[PDB]
Structure formats: structure tokens, C-alpha cells
Amino acid sequence: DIQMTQSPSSLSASVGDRVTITCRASQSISSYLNWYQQKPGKAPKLLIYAASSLQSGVPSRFSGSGSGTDFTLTISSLQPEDFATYYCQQSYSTPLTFGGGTKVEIKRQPREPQVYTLPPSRDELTKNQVSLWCLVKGFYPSDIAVEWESNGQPENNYKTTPPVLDSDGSFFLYSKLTVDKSRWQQGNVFSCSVMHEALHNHYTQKSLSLS
Amino acid sequence: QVQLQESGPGLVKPSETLSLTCTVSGGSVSSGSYYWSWIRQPPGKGLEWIGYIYYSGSTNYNPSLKSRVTISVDTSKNQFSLKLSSVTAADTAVYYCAREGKNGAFDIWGQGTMVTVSSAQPREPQVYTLPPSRDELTKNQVSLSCAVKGFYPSDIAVEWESNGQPENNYKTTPPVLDSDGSFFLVSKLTVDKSRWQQGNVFSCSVMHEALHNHYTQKSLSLSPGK
Lengths: 211, 226
Description:
It is classed as biosynthetic protein. Chain A is mainly β. Chain A has one helix at residues 181-185, and strands at 4-7, 10-13, 19-25, 33-38, 45-49, 53-54, 62-67, 70-75, 84-90, 102-106, 114-118, 129-139, 145-150, 153-154, 158-160, 164-165, 171-180, 190-195, 204-208. Chain A has two domains: 4-106, Immunoglobulin-like (Sandwich); 114-209, Sandwich (Immunoglobulin-like). Chain A is elongated and about 70 Å long. The interface between A and B is large, with 49 and 44 residues.
């Protein structure tokens, strides 16, 4: 079985930069190494076959070089739609193997997060527990931490979704704090705390209480 | 253009067989120079090649998966199916069917179908719509939230609609494992502020195997007459 090493495993680059991915094989595979593009939640898309032959419909900004054991995929000027994870695949001997993958994130400018607290839906008031929501959107970069607190003490029963890329290049997420219905109805004040590099003093809070 | 879509159940119990069939449309399965193959990808993991089949019936399998893998061809239905026996949780992944082209390999992929391998019983999703935060009404666009929680397995689909017509400008978070072993996610639909304040009615659609008819709807509107 042939091992495929890909580097770098992750990289962030700006628009117009040259991107370089390394694919190394444990043995010689001549010029049988295909390149694929997989966007999040989508199937992979063939970009380059052989080592330098461009698949129909692929823009010319994609280019591949290499022969034998050392190969390289190159994008000349990165475009916003080129955000995806790229794989190399050897095509010489079975079993066919893919590279470890190289996630290409887009480099851009920091943005202040907007934080919004959402009370539970009326439908949920039938249950013994209710969900408190905290939407954090419009922030960059994706490095963020979100905590809940009440009366100065941390709340434990909360879950936070991973950052999700929005259509404008920023990120958003939701945090769900699950509390007992009795605690909510009595008017206890809960706070969603967000720490991010683009915030003033790297910290902000939003409160949420029953109206 | 040739298209590949895959079918089969998305939840199998451990120590059972996994069955998937890939239907080829817009092209012929029984043409040399093509290798109809199966590739799986566990969530957050990489791509693993399973094996291919030739239209004559000849098969090449990945050695790690041999004695458990059976790929076949039905030329009379333009189909090639995959069987995977004695299954564990290590087989929970997104399974793709693809064809290996004349040049290189894998010029046409399927949409992907996720199969979860577990002994747990399916949970029906609870769907809740949340209006935009009051603080957000100062912006030019507002966010409508559709919370889907308490469902199992994680394979789920969420769409937005208004007046019978699809609303496109939405994003959905990946499923997140909750503390009780079920999953939840939220879909954020972004609309112009004016549409929200005028009382436009938006609908969140959720499709999941544990729902009656695999489908449910929840509405969300600013109802000013209240």
C-alpha cells in the first residue's frame, strides 16, 4: 500500500496569492496523480489528471507539476470561491490512496462579532427544560470562545456549534444553554460571554432575561 | 452530462450488512474504459477507496475491506451496488459512488449518502423557529433562526421557503452532539429588514428519516396584528 503525504495540512492565504501544496509518495508513481477539490458538505471535484493535464471546465489558474515521487499543485491567484479542501490521489497501483488533505482558508481582515441573545420559542415552554440561544455572527477570524454565566457563576449545561462560514466571508455560530424551566420563569438573568481578538478589550457580554 | 446518485438506508445496526446502490443516469454502465467504484469518507476524516467493478463483473477490493465487501453490477438496470457485511461504528461515513475515467481517475462523483452504524434507536427532531433579536433590527438585514434539536442519527436536511418558493440566502451549522447523545443544529436565514417588518411569512422545512413522511414544517413571521 502506497502512503500519500500532503503538506501543508492547513494554510490561510490572501486573494491573489500563489498557493503551493506538496504531495509526496512513498514510491515512484510516474505521472499518475490526480488532484481534487472538495468544498464543505459537497462531493470532491476533479481538477487535474495525469500531473499537469487540466480537466474540462476547470479555470486556468490551477496548475500541477511533478513526476515520480514529488508533486505540487499551484493556484496562481486565489479567488474567493476557491475556499475548499484539496486532495491528491495516486493512480498507479492498487489500493488507490488519497492524500491527507490541505484546507485552504482565505486570509482577510478582523471583524467585530455581533452578539444576539434569543429567548426560547413559545413551543418549548411545554417541556421541563428550555433552551437559551446566543447568536454570534459577523466575526473574523474563526478563533473564538463562548461561555455562559449566571449570577457571576459559570453555567455548565451549554453546547456551542463550530464556526460556520457565511456568504460575506465572516463567521457565525449559535450557543445553546439548557436551563430548568423554573429558573427561566422566575426571572433569573443569564449572560452570554464572548472572547475574540476583534472586540474591545477582547471581551463582551450580552444579557438575557424574561420580559 | 452523466450523473450518479446513491440510495439505501442511512442507519444499520452493528453486525449487519450495509447495502447501497448507485444509479447511473445519462450514460451507460456497460462501457469499457470506466471503473465503477466506491469511496467513503468518515466525518472530518479523509477519503478511503473501497473498490471498483468492471461491467463484465470483475472486482478489485481494498485488502483491509476484503471478506466484508461485495460490489456488483446490474447491467439491465444501469446500476452497481455495494454490500458491506459485519459492520461496526468504524464504517459510519459518507459513501460516494464514482466512475474512474479514461484519463486518470474519478471524473464523475455521486452526491454522497451518509450511513450511520449504531444500535441506538432513531429520535424524531424537534423544530423551533426563533425571530430576530431586537438589537438586530437596527441593521439592514436580519437573521431568522430555525433550531432543530433532539434528533438521531445526524443525517438531516433543512430548507427555507416563503410563499411556496425557496429562499436561498441561508446557512446551516453542522450537527452538534448534545449531552444526551442526540444531535442539534441551527439554520440562519438572512432577509432584508423590510421583509420582516412587513409581516412576510417564512417557513423552515426539515427532512429526517425519523419524521412522519420524513418531513415537517414550521412557520416564522412577525405577526403585527397581535
